[PDB]
Design a protein around this ligand. Structure first.
Ligand SMILES: */C=C\C(=O)Nc1ccccc1Nc1cc(N(CCCN2CCN(C)CC2)C(=O)Nc2c(Cl)c(OC)cc(OC)c2Cl)ncn1
Length: 288
């Protein structure tokens, strides 16, 4: 861990990083808030990923892989960008953009009606920005595999930023019954070919994006509440599709249903979703 080669254009001297509050423990790393001086005399709030106290040699390898993948993908306004690393004279820190308004599920839930209310235009605009993020990632051949409002973060200026996109495919033993911190099952966002045949593509991320649209328009609603894994598989095998949320146009509902085509080749692309959402935003009212 203290024997890592430097990548000089990314390297930040450790003493320029003021560590702050821990956000607790992830799968192979952990995240702490911090402030970074420079990136000259200016502080930027950042989030930092580092190793757990009890950390395997594979954890270290995974943390490095995620960093290097972030470098290869490059920057975009609608993703959480790599800003820096500390690789020398101490523990590995991977330093990213900090999004101050939490994840999109929380952002949306906090702005449900009885401060800050979201207009219909604001909701379509979150969708647009996520789609744009995902279009960028798709153009870099990055398949997300867990696209969901939980993995979108919102900046101080209400920008949407896709998170957690730099993970290499797990040599798949994915545990279907594992829940999120908030008690929900990630299997509920997965395309059926992903769930049943373990095939993940841009097309399967477009299915996940449809569930994300439904989350946006339910203001952080929970898909399939109270449905366990076995019953979810049966709903999918039957061709069940979630109901149209209230306060969602027929057009946005058709976009969801199109994202949820049984035939992956027949779903829209993110390129097509970006275009449609661009047109829809312009036509959607900000008056309520
Ligand atoms: C900028 C102000 C601020 O304090 N923001 C803030 C406070 C509290 C909670 C979240 C945030 N915003 C934020 C967080 C992150 N994280 C942490 C997201 C929440 N954790 C998920 C993991 N769980 C184990 C703890 C809770 C984040 O992980 N960022 C992140 C890192 Cl560190 C990363 O390292 C390589 C790679 C990615 O994505 C590729 C991300 Cl998203 N990030 C930004 N703002």
């Amino acid at each position: 861990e203290y024997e890592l080669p430097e990548d000089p254009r990314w390297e930040l001297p450790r003493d320029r990083l003021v560590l702050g509050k821990p956000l607790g423990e992830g799968a192979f790393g952990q995240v702490v808030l911090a402030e970074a001086i420079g990136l000259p005399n200016r502080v930027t709030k950042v989030a930092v990923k580092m190793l757990k106290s009890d950390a395997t040699e594979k954890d270290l390898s995974d943390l490095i892989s995620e960093m290097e993948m972030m470098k290869m993908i490059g920057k975009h306004k609608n993703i959480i960008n790599l800003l820096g690393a500390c690789t020398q004279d101490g523990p590995l820190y991977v330093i990213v953009e900090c999004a101050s308004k939490g994840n999109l599920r929380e952002y949306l839930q906090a702005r449900r009606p009885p401060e800050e209310q979201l207009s219909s235009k604001d909701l379509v605009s979150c969708a647009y920005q996520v789609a744009r993020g995902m279009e960028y990632l798709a153009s870099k051949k990055c398949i997300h595999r867990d696209l969901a409002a939980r993995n979108v973060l919102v900046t101080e200026d209400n920008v949407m930023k896709i998170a957690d996109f730099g993970l290499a495919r797990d040599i798949h033993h994915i545990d279907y019954y594992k829940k999120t911190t908030n008690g929900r099952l990630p299997v509920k966002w997965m395309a059926p070919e992903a769930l049943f045949d373990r095939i993940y593509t841009h097309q399967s991320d477009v299915w996940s994006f449809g569930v994300l649209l439904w989350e946006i328009f339910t203001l952080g609603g929970s898909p399939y509440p109270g449905v366990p894994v076995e019953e979810l598989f049966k709903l999918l095998k039957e061709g069940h599709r979630m109901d149209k949320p209230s306060n969602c146009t027929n057009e946005l509902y058709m976009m969801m249903r199109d994202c949820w085509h049984a035939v992956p080749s027949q779903r829209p692309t993110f390129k097509q979703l970006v275009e449609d959402l661009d047109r829809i935003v312009a036509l959607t009212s900000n008056q309520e």
